Amino acid sequence: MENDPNLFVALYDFVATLSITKGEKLRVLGYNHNGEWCEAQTKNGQGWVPSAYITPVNS
Ligand code: NA
Ligand code: NA
Numbered sequence: 001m002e003n004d005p006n007l008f009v010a011l012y013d014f015v016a017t018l019s020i021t022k023g024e025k026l027r028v029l030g031y032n033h034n035g036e037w038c039e040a041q042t043k044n045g046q047g048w049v050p051s052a053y054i055t056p057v058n059s
Contacts, residue, residue: 002058003057003058004027004057004058005056005058006027006028006029006056007025007026007027007028007056007057007058008025008026008027008028008038008040008054008055008056008057009023009024009025009026009054009055009056009057010022010023010024010025010026010049010053010054011053011054011055012053014049014050014053016047017047017048017049018040018042018044018045018046018047018048018049019044019047020040020042020049020053020054024042024043025042025043025057026038026040026041026042026049026054027040027041027042028040028041028054028056029041029046031051032048035051036050036051036052037049037050037051038050038051038054040054
């Protein structure tokens with residue numbers, strides 16, 4: 001499915017900033033300067049998540 005380009009999925013659990021669970025869909029709204037941190041929105045709120053822990057859904 002073509003998804004929002006800022007729709008990401010968590011690759012790993014990440015615990016706080018936003019806590020995410022592997023497989024969780026997140027909406028990335030923003031990056032820090034180098035994009036290693038994402039201001040992301042999930043079903044649980046917004047906060048920073050590391051890019052290293054997430055990946056865009058689209059391919
Ligand atoms: Na991806
Ligand atoms: Na794909």
